[PDB]
Design a protein around this ligand. Sequence first.
Ligand SMILES: [Mg+2]
Ligand SMILES: [Mg+2]
Ligand SMILES: [Mg+2]
Lengths: 250, 250
Amino acid sequence: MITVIAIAKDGSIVEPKLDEISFEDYRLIWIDCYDPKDEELYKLSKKIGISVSDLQIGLDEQEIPRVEEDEDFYLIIYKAPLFEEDITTTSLGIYIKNNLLLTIHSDKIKAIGRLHKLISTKKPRIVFERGIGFLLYHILNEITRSYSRILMNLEDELEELEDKLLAGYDREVMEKILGLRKTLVYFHKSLIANRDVLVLLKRKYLPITTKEDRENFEDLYYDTLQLIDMSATYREVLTSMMDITLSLEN
Amino acid sequence: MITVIAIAKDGSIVEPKLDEISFEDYRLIWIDCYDPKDEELYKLSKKIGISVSDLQIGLDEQEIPRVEEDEDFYLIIYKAPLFEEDITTTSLGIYIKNNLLLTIHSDKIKAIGRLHKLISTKKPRIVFERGIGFLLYHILNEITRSYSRILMNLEDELEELEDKLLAGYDREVMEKILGLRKTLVYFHKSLIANRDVLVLLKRKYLPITTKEDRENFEDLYYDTLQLIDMSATYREVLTSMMDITLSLEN
Ligand SMILES: [Mg+2]
Ligand SMILES: [Mg+2]
Ligand SMILES: [Mg+2]
């Protein structure tokens, strides 16, 4: 059971990377902590003044998306897609403590690795000095893009499947239909939960959020809403096709 | 071997029936003409009063994206992803005459469905009044999003390809490699040609675009550059894997 315990750190102007650190030298900080060994986990607690119990939360990929508010910090449970023999969702914890943003998760969140890969491929130029409603914002924006993307390929799958119905009565069809129903269930439930996290973020006045960031989450809120309607529409599609392979046999 | 010839007719506030319509009954009208039988096309020129020749620009899918200036109208050629067993890109003309945005394409364009479908579900009236410096960008955006969807997707095939080389040579892999090169080559060329179109729209003051459209095309310009970068990044990766497939055997 390879457990990576990968941690990815960032900072002020511009283009930093580090581990055992000050972060008073930095405008903001993104520590992406990926699925830590029990030893590197405390390594983090020591560091950021965020306790492991408080942290162990954002590590439970079954945690319901939400926002918990300041003790020393802010917690946002968010849902990201989880890609496996069947696609699913999974929960990233995100803790914002003053100038530090942490992502903490059990499964890799492709949205994160993209920024990371991008971020390491990205020049000194791009301005995050707006950040940490901003950073958080992109993190959700990206995860969203993940959803948006999967839904786009799913609508792709629905199209092939529709002509594959000309075969009918098919063992494989019902099995793939449902598999797709499954993902669609995970999403709809998650984008709605995430929608409910977005709801607060586009509205609630927060130290972490500025108006400009608050502007974003309304976009992201309505985008997510886009994704929720679709999840449901693809669902409607699925049951209808489910109606066909039933009439064809079972 | 049909010519699918689907005339979609949309106008504010939100409804159908071309080949009787009175302009200036609406803010704007969106006519999408997909792969018309020239019976249906001639009718279209007649109604919109663009030279039947000038519309034929639009149906040429080899056309290099660009912006061309008035003969009684505006014209944008743009490269959008094209789907098959293997993916490439295909040109659509977009003509803007007064309040009429006409999107004309010989090949299906994934993005235009996604607006025609969105619109179907999308609510009516107030306010699309932002329309048609806006309407243009959205199509352009949805297209760009077509590309972005497939890159992040193609990226998957790359990760999945890295393993297949543990299986070593795989003339299969090599062809799959040449396949994803083929796709990428079209994207890169296309995103280049799109890019400039957007640099034009992002800069040049135009009757069809407003100040806000141009900022909106600037965003679109940015991601286009990302996509080119990814496309760049990805061909890179496929040059290596190929070199690899080759150090196996051949
Ligand atoms: Mg078929
Ligand atoms: Mg691997
Ligand atoms: Mg494998």
